[PDB]
Structure formats: C-alpha cells, structure tokens
Design a binder for this molecule. Structure first.
Ligand SMILES: Nc1ncnc2c1ncn2[C@@H]1O[C@H](COS(=O)(=O)NC(=O)C[C@H](N)c2ccccc2Br)[C@@H](O)[C@H]1O
Ligand SMILES: Nc1ncnc2c1ncn2[C@@H]1O[C@H](COS(=O)(=O)NC(=O)C[C@H](N)c2ccccc2Br)[C@@H](O)[C@H]1O
Lengths: 496, 496
C-alpha cells in the first residue's frame, strides 16, 4: 500500500544501492576488530527497515527525524526513508535537548527514530518514536493515524531537511545531481575506503556517503570519540586501511600539533578532501609535506546546493600564496559575480557576490517563504524568465585564468580598510612557539593563539603587516573551540 | 569564445544527436521524390549553423526567433541555438504580422531567423535578421554589440519559449526529462518513421522531434499544404513509408469524411498518437476500424510541462464508452485532484482540479511573475517545503482503478446542470447525414454540423438527451474551423 520510488526516478535509494547489483559482495562499510558490510547486506538492511517503516502508514512528504551519527544502520534508515518518499531530518545526538525541541516544534515530524542504544529520552507524544538496530526497526510509540494522498514519488520530492531554526529543504533530484557531477570528476574509485568525519546532521557527511556508495567504494565512518585524540585517530585510519580522509580543516589540527611523525606513516592515504572553511595555509603546507602522495582537494559551497566546486591544491603550495583557489564550478554549475549595484563583475581581482546556477538547488527554507525569496532570487542576468539563482552570501573574485578565490561572507566583512583575518593568523602562525591562531573583530582586532611574550608577537606582526592588521590584544588559549560541525567557533572566542 | 553546452549537462543538442555516434548513416529525416537525411548529416548541418551563430557574439539566454515549420533546416537551427544556450522562440510563418510584432515587442529577441525562401518582410532594426538554408546561416542585419557575461551553460538554462502574449519558458532539464520519461514507455523504435503534423510553434511538434531523434528513429514532417487535402495527405504518408502518425484529432477529419477506403490502405502505419483536445469517439471508432493494426495513444498535458500522460485506447473502443481515459501520469509525474476547498479528492467519480508534480515543469511565464505565482503554486499537500506544483486549469476525476478522465477547463464549464458538449456532439454524430458536430454555449446551447432537417435532428437528440442538453439551434457549416495549431476554433463558430 505504501508508495515506493521507481528505479527510473532520481532517488537516493536507487543511486546509493546500484552497486548491490554490479558488485554485491564488495564492501560498502568498514567499521572497527575491523568488520565489513557488503553492498548486498546493506540493501538487505535498507529493505528490512523500509518494510517496517511502510507499516506506519506515513504519506509521501511526512518527515522522519533521524538522530544518529554516520553508521551502517543510520545510512540504512535514510535510504529506507528515501525509497518511501519520507524526507529525513538528520540530528546528531550531541544536539542539546532545547535545540532538538525547537526543530520538533517547527518541523512537526511524524516519526523520531534513534539507535537501540541512543539516549534521547524526552520526545513529545504527537511524534512517533522508534529505535533501529541489528534487530530491525522497533516502534515504541506509533505515529498518529492519517490518510495517504500521494500516489507516486517524484524527483522533486524532498530527500532531507538540514536544520541549523533554518531548515534547508533538498530534493532527491538536487542531491543526486550533485553526486552525478562529482562522480564525473573521478575523485575516487571503487577500491577506495573513504574515512568520513562529519556529523550526520552536516551535509558534508551526506556528500561523503553518496560519493562512496554511488561510486561502489567503502565508507569508513570515524567516530567523534576516535577523532578527538590524535594517536587514536591515526590508529583508526591505519587499522581500517582508509585511502581518503574527508572532513573540515580542524580534524588535522591535533594530529599536526602532537603527532606529525605518526601522521607521515599513513602510507595508504591517497587523498584528503576538506571544505566548509578556509584551511590556514601554514597548517595545510605542514600536512602536505607529511603526506606527499596524498592529493588534497578544496571543496567549496553551501547546504543550499550541497556544494559548488572541488579544486585540487597546488603541489607544493607556493610559500607566498595568500589564498587557495576555489577553482571552477562543477560541470553543469555556473557563477556570476555581481557588484553592490547588482551588475556583473568581469574585472580580474575585483570581489562581487557569488550568484550560483546549480542543478542541485534547495527547494526553499522550511516554513520561511520570505527568507526563500531573499536567497533564491530572479537571475539578475535574465530577470524576465522566472529562472532563479542562489544569492550565496559569499564574496569572491576571479584570477587571470577565470578561477575563483573566496573572500568571506558579504555580511561579516578598521580605518577605512577591509581586514583579512587570514593574513593576521598567517603571520602569527609563523611566530616561533605559536601552534594555532584565530583573529577576530569585536571594531577592535583580537587574536587567540595556542602556544610566550604578547609584545614580541605584536612587533613580529608589525614587521610585515599594516597598522590596521596588528592585533590590539593576543590571548593564549589551550584549544581553538569548534562548532558541533567542526568549524571555528568565533562566537565562543568572542565571549572571553 | 562562445560558450557551448557540455555533453554531461542536459541539453537538446546532445540528447537529439546521440544517434549520430551510435548510428551515423541511419535516417533522421524523410522528406518528399523521397529523400533521407542521416543523423551524421543532420549533426554536420547543426555544427555549421552553430559555428555561424557563435560569430554573432550573443550571450547565453539571448533569444532567437525561429520562423519556420518543421524541416531539417529548422530542426538544425533549434539544435544549434540549444548548443549555444540561446533560447529559441518558434513562430510559424502563418502567424499574422501584428501577432509577430507583439511577440517581438515583449520578447525583445537578439536575432530573427527564417528560411532562405521565407516571406517575413517587416522586422524592427533592433532585432538582427538571418536566413538559413542549404547554403548555411546568412546574416542580413547583425544583432547589436554586447558583452558576454555567462561562462557556462547549465541544465536550467532556457531551451525555448512558446508564445500564444503568454510566453511559456521551458529549460533544457525540463524538456529532456519529458523525453526520457516517454523513451521509457517504448512508444516507438529506431526503425519507425514518425509523420509529424503540428506547426513548429506548438510544443506537440517539439515533442515529436525529440521523441524521434532521441530514439534514433526518422521524422517525416507533413507540410500543411499536404495535410489539407485528404488524397494528397494519404499519398504523402504512403510514399514516405510513415509507420506512426502524430497530430491533433482534426488531422483525420477530412480523410475519414472523404477517403476512408484509401485510409484503410495505409498498411505500414503501426501507431497513431493524438493530443491537445478530445477525439470525438464516433470519429475515433471509425479510424480504429479502418486501421485495426494501428495502436492509438491519447496524449494529455499542457505546454507548462510539455505533457503529463500517454494512454493506449482500448481495442476496440466500447460502443457505450462516454470518455476515453487519460490514464496514469508518466513515471516521475504525480497528480493530486484538489476540490474547490483546496482539499484532496479521493472519491471515485468526483472531479477536482489537476495539480501536477513533474520533472518537466516550466520556469515561469515570460515577464509575468504575477501569472507565474497563480499557476506554479505552493504544493497544497506540502505547503511549508517551498516545492511547487502546476495548478493546471483542468478538471478530472478518477475511475475505480485510479485512472484519470479529463473533465474540461475549470474556467470554461444550463438549469443548474453542467453541460457535457461531447455528449451533445456524440448524439448528433450518430444522426444519419451528420459528418461532424461541435456544440457551444453563448447560457444558450448551439450545435454546428457538417452534413438536412434541424427539427428531426432536435427530436433525435431529445430521444436520449436530457432537456438542458438539447441544442436551441443547429446550423449547417461546410467545415469545422481550426486554430493555427489545429484545435477546434470555438471562438470562430461563436461569431456566426
Ligand atoms: N572551501 C571553503 N573555503 C572557505 N569557506 C568555505 C568553503 N566551503 C564553504 N565555505 C563557507 O561555508 C559556507 C557554507 O556553510 S554550510 O552551508 O554550512 N556548508 C558547508 O559548510 C559544507 C558544504 N555544504 C559542503 C558539502 C559537501 C562537500 C563540500 C562542502 Br564545502 C559557504 O557559504 C562559505 O561561506
Ligand atoms: N488528451 C487530451 N484530451 C482532452 N484535452 C486535452 C488533451 N490534451 C490536452 N488537452 C487540453 O489542452 C490543454 C493544453 O493545451 S496546450 O498547452 O496548448 N498543450 C497542448 O495542446 C499539447 C501538449 N503540450 C502536448 C505536447 C506533446 C504531446 C502531447 C501533448 Br497533449 C490541456 O490543459 C487540456 O485542457
């Protein structure tokens, strides 16, 4: 009685499980005692979860909150939801109770599902509850009764909604279009094992999962408790035979600081992919020199299109390079840089706001048509057609070869001088004893460093940097704090 | 210097010319002395036209008016425009000068192109002019100078704009999604020769072209001057070895009236496809009985998605059948019937307004965001996501098996009784001497018939029909008048 997506219609289920046919006994997951789960065994688990979910009587478009990190069972659940046209809302179990309640209030999901050993204890009676594990999907409280109205699942149906409360609605057509565009780049092969570090609630995790499974490669989910300690992290990558390591730049900071010798021993690592924020070039040059046979790729873009561009870093990174390129949009993507007059920037080295034409565009912000209209805007180069672009909120400029360079959030840019915090941080990272450095503007410029004479550090900055870029104050901190998704927590540093 | 669509990106060029690689010397066109043009020779002509167009310096999204009917040269031009990301605006040369000027005023195209022997003589100086033929694309007046701003062509770029002044903007992604969905139905094979009758300006012509060329079949364009005379029309289908005949129901009316014996001699015809309006069942039963080995398919939908459903008629058509089904939406399409309260209709036999979820959706109405917002509306079953549906303007109901039945335009539906003009016309078509019949409401009910005693014809209606369905007046006419696209011209009949 439940609708199911047809094989010919864009849908995560069919996209990620195609290798169960062409290579059933190849590994889809490697986990640690190292264990593998084949494509065939993954599809079996998806199909068993989907049979159980289909019993609950949910209509296509009914929302399922999936509280999990990246595991074989969580990926089996999101693929079962996919097949049934039930958009999933991934939430990491580290999400505070109040923030989850805020998501439940706005999203009004039919069902909340967590792992058998999950610890969420406080979900409202209107929301159904279930636990998933080895033993199948187990309903605790059934979702409320309803009538199904949707006969057939389409490509524009919602695959997932990313909540940060801002909810980015992605369609199956959009996410599959991003996977097809990156598969065309041959980043990885079926013999790769992709170590993924991002929380499931971050679309960088959903990118890694669909890249690996769509290619017929293996996914090696790195638990947060392994990632947080440098020798433990390196032993996990070695034991699992990871060939590719994906994550935000911060995943390398402890290893580079405490264990560079053991990092250099990861002889099977063929590639590193980072995204979500700038990689400090002194840290990136350190990593590149420890692993000379790992290709490093810089991934750029936003939840609103999943991503935009994937750009191999130069080998070696020029010692005087100020900014890595974010390259050229993927095939089928296009960028216009518009100035503050709404007009195209063609001039080399002049920043404008990225307006993106993408086949992977979000459907809209959940219950926020006004926010949608400010971001998905009429194409400024073709305003009479009805075609929309993503007004990205990002600045960038082009080089002599048409390649892009990211230039910060439009809304987050001293003495009539634009500060480049990356330039301040670069010069402090080059000061003897400084391991890490983050600069921020309260406008007053403070730097936080992981190690000390502040006065010697200021004069060292003043040797190369203009007056407006010299930090007013330099504060020693034990750690650079991170957001749940692994980005620099500048709001936390502002508090001290 | 001109941008060109990449092979991996949805685009008419790559879609329609794939067979130039897999089957270069197979026929793409059959024309009449019967001549063929191979896939390889078509791609050569497209590439030569595209090289010439690329010289003009147009930017992606710049509009090209293509004044032509369906010919190898016109199809080569629309594919050259496709490759360069220049949306084409197809206009039939039968379009009156005033109507073309109205289109030029609103669309503001960069270029107007017509055939070497075309007769349009009055195009404004701001619009560039060119003629295309055997001898290539020939510029008469260059388009105005501009700066190109678009670096890369995407799938959401506009392929064409259909003007009726209402302009339906279609994307390459949308039109290719319709072709892929119909290719999945195996209507035709590469050995088919598809006789196409629609003017190029009607998207039924664009459907036939992409179906044939996407399949690797041959297209047999039927000139209007061959279509208008029944023996001439039948000799053309026989000489060209047509295996499939596509067109609006009116293309059969003269043949059925004057030449049913010769129609029965079309031994190579394996299939008939009609769309755009109801086929009067007495005429459709006549045709089906003359050509018992031709499959007949009923195509339903609107320019706004190109089409929705393709439904083989029953063989034979039940003599008591009142309404042909419009079946089930294609794979990847979905219909909700909503009532006048905006709520889903689940009840068998109750009409509601078709709301369509389609991968082939139009981008919007040209320069009419208000009309766009009244037609591409928030999904009424999922209004908080941002997902849109097509509010079709069509009524339909479902049968016991979930199949649809078209029930007229919502806006165009006597004594507190809904009139079904098809029922009036059916009973008059069954009256001895009546060849054709059209009923219309001025509300006063008039019927126009092609042949006579009006009084005997009224009493014959009154034998089976309720009082409110008996025509007030019956007028003998020589011909049922048609619109340029071949539909019943009810506005013309209203004038008499
Ligand atoms: N390479 C980058 N360099 C510098 N800044 C970057 C970068 N990528 C994102 N950003 C910034 O993050 C913003 C996007 O933040 S986000 O919406 O949370 N998305 C992400 O961080 C991850 C992104 N969706 C993504 C997914 C999959 C693969 C790569 C990437 Br990037 C973007 O608009 C930029 O401001
Ligand atoms: N099969 C049908 N039976 C009865 N009515 C039909 C039918 N198809 C369209 N219509 C009516 O035409 C309307 C659409 O008019 S239109 O926008 O000019 N489109 C067409 O006539 C042709 C349509 N785009 C089409 C293209 C390609 C293949 C099939 C078809 Br149908 C539609 O909304 C219905 O009201």
């Amino acid at each position: 009685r439940a609708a199911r997506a047809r094989e010919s219609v864009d849908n995560l289920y069919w996209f990620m499980l195609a290798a169960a046919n062409s290579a059933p006994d190849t590994p889809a997951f490697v986990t640690r005692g190292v264990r593998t789960l084949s494509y065939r065994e993954l599809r079996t688990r998806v199909d068993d979860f989907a049979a159980a979910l289909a019993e609950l009587g949910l209509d296509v478009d009914d929302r399922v909150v999936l509280e999990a990190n990246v595991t074989p069972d969580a990926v089996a659940m999101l693929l079962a939801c996919s097949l049934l046209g039930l958009p999933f809302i991934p939430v990491s179990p580290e999400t505070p109770s109040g923030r989850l309640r805020s998501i439940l209030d706005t999203a009004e999901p039919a069902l909340f599902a967590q792992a058998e050993d999950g610890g969420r204890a406080d979900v409202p009676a209107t929301v159904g509850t279930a636990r998933f594990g080895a033993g199948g999907l187990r309903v605790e409280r059934a979702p409320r009764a309803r009538v199904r109205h949707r006969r057939e699942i389409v490509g524009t149906d919602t695959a997932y909604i990313i909540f940060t409360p801002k909810g980015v609605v992605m369609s199956h057509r959009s996410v599959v279009s991003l996977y097809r565009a990156i598969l065309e780049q041959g980043l990885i092969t079926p013999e790769d094992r992709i170590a993924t570090t991002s929380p499931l609630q971050f679309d960088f995790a959903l990118f890694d999962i669909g890249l690996a499974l769509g290619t017929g490669a293996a996914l090696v989910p790195v638990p947060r408790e392994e990632l947080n300690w440098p020798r433990r992290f390196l032993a996990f990558l070695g034991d699992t035979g990871a060939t590719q390591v994906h994550g935000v730049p911060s995943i390398w900071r402890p290893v580079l600081r405490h264990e560079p010798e053991l990092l250099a021993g990861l002889d099977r690592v063929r590639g590193i992919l980072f995204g979500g924020e700038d990689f400090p070039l002194p840290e990136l040059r350190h990593l590149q020199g420890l692993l000379p046979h790992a290709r490093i790729v810089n991934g750029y873009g936003a939840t609103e299109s999943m991503a935009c561009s994937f750009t191999e870093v130069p080998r070696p990174i020029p010692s005087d390079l100020e900014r890595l390129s974010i390259g050229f949009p993927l095939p089928g993507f296009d960028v216009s840089l518009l100035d503050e007059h709404g007009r195209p920037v063609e001039e080399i080295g002049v920043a404008g706001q990225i307006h993106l034409r993408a086949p992977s565009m979000f459907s809209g912000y959940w219950d926020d048509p006004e926010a949608t209209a400010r971001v998905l805007v009429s194409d400024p180069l073709d305003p009479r057609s009805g075609r929309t672009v993503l007004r990205s909120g990002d600045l960038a400029y082009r080089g002599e070869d048409g390649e892009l360079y990211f230039a910060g959030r439009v809304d987050a840019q001293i003495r009539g001088n634009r500060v480049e915090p990356g330039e301040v941080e670069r010069r402090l990272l080059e000061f003897p004893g400084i391991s890490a450095a983050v600069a921020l503007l309260v406008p007053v410029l403070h730097a936080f460093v992981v190690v000390f004479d502040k006065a010697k550090a200021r004069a060292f900055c003043a040797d190369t940097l203009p007056g407006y870029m010299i930090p007013a104050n330099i504060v020693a901190v034990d750690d650079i704090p991170l957001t749940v998704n692994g980005k620099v927590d500048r709001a936390d540093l502002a508090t001290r």
